[model samples]
Target: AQNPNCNIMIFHPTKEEFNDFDKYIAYMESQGAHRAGLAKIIPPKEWKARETYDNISEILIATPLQQVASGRAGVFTQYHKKKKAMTVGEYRHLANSKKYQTPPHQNFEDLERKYWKNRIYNSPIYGADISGSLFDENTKQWNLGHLGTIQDLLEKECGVVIEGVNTPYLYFGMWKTTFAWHTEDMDLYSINYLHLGEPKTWYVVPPEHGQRLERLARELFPGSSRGCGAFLRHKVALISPTVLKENGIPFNRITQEAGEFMVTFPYGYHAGFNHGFNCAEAINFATPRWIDYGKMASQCSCGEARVTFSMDAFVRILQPERYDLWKRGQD
Candidate 1:
């Protein structure tokens, strides 16, 4: 029995530690927080994020897809539905409106047939990178452009801004707007903060079980897995804990609330759904320790399809001595 309790490591940083930014996350990582694949941070009570983004419009929308059918074995629901476009204000209207029925806790047999839950996810925070603007305007802890801790090994070392990986993305969701199972690009760590609204329930598969999940995925979705080592990048699968348990895969559950942060470790596969109307901002980051994992990721299908940064350039800059050693090794 893979501990039924959620048991995800939660760190409560003091105001000063949290303010220090770089040291806080580094300390958390050193404390074996990444072993669970996911960790939660309860920011100092006084920490807050900016809440006004009503004027932002033209956001992308995702329509729900059916999960499973009558005769199929239990696996992740393949998500290949079409997308639409809408405004932030309009989405809030639909989320608050009583037109659609909420997804039931257990039974989802009639999810798509019952009610269409349109979702707005991965909407890039464009124009002004509001990561700093939305914060207290004093600290750079939550500032995406200047996440000193993660970027010290990245931008500060290599001088490359990896856009989506380094930049922040915004998400807005109502009840049951699900994000399917997948790992972060380049096997880098990811940090997400729920600014406001309902909490998010997340399921994470630890690094040890990553290959096991992939094996299960290959058996389940043979077509997608064929020839593609990183087929999970498709973002289609949605395996539940019950299914993972049956296959002997260990996992942890996390409930992320507003004013908190959820950090995903390298190669950790995670997926979850929103409780209700809520806004969150997230970004991907890399530590020096992530270099080897990044190299491993570059050897897969995602190496070409989902590349956000250059690994060779990263090594050439940050770890020059190792780069020279590898250069001699290659020679």
Candidate 2:
């Protein structure tokens, strides 16, 4: 097996791909799946991989891993805890403190390309999606300059008056870098658009089976005086997809190609890793049904918000003629 490494890739449109807007929501509802794909979303020339490395680096390098890495940029490893802020332009080289940092070769664009060819399963900078985009913090509107993302034309039927952080998040992924299995904040929905590079593979667990998975995890945990326990981690839970399926918990596997938006559903358990170097933007938005998932997220959170958002105000906004919530509002 020579491992061309980029074959057998599937593109969008299979009933799961974005079709009609409202029905897409209903589709997530029916399968109890909280994840789907938005295919054929071609990024503009600038957003494409062929762009100069400086352009991509300018956007990604400044994406400090505020919460996770304490406002620094660098690769992550158990040895360094989370991120070891590195000196710029030096690949795997250290900062003054001597930790791994993003490479700063004079021709880093070419170096970055060469790095991917010799890819090792290592964790690099993360949380890049939080900044560096066409998001307006004051108004919370999203634009891509010349690119038309689904996130651009995105419309939500839930129509809550108070829109949350709804900006696009950037991600700079290295080979084998990972995100552990977890649901989106408030168990709402999320869409991650890969700006460029090799595809990332994802695993999904339907919401209907979420609770069952939780119970199963506890059953397999090592016994302790604390009684049934949940595993905590900076990354990588011992209870992975393999353990999940060994117990007969079926999951869906999908590899998101560059330039496509991967939508994760409310109350879905999803996780995945990068195939190689890549950049993506992800964001969260809510639908009416997500409120219930809010409760579940509050009970357990890892590197995400713990408190659930209230629907009382949102209920007052939707009219009774249109929403069942307004009928329940006692207007």
Output the number of the lDDT-best candidate. Answer: 1
Score candidate 2 by lDDT: 0.45
Candidate 1 clashes between residue pairs 3 or more apart in a chain or in different chains: none
- The segments of candidate 1 whose C-alpha lies over 4 angstroms from its true place after superposition are 1-7, 51-74, 80-84, 99-133, 149-165, 298-331
C-alpha lDDT of all candidate models, in order: 0.62, 0.45
- Candidate 2 lDDT, tens digit per residue, 1-331? 2112211223333433433444554544454333332112333333233233444432325333422221112222212234443222331121111233334444434443433332233334443434545323331112332222222222243333353224455676654455655666445577677766666777676665666655664565334213313232223232445456678875666677776666676666676666556667776665556555543442221221222233333332432232352233223
Q: Tell how far residue 146 is off in model 1, in angstroms.
A: 2.4
Q: Residue 145 of model 2: what lDDT?
A: 24
- C-alpha RMSD of each candidate structure in angstroms: 7.2, 10.7
Query: How far off is residue 102 in model 2, in Å?
Result: 16
Model 2 stretches with alpha carbons more than 4 Å out: 1-54, 60-129, 134-164, 220-238, 295-298, 301-331
Per-residue C-alpha lDDT of model 1 across residues 1-331, encoded as one tens digit per residue: 3323434789988777877666776787777777778999888776656445554445544332322211133354544333344555666666666643244544332433222223332121111112322444555556554674444566555576543224676777766666768888657889888877777788898876788888888887787677566677766676666677888877877678877889998988898776657777777787767867765652333332333344445445445555664344333
- lDDT, model 1, position 69: 18
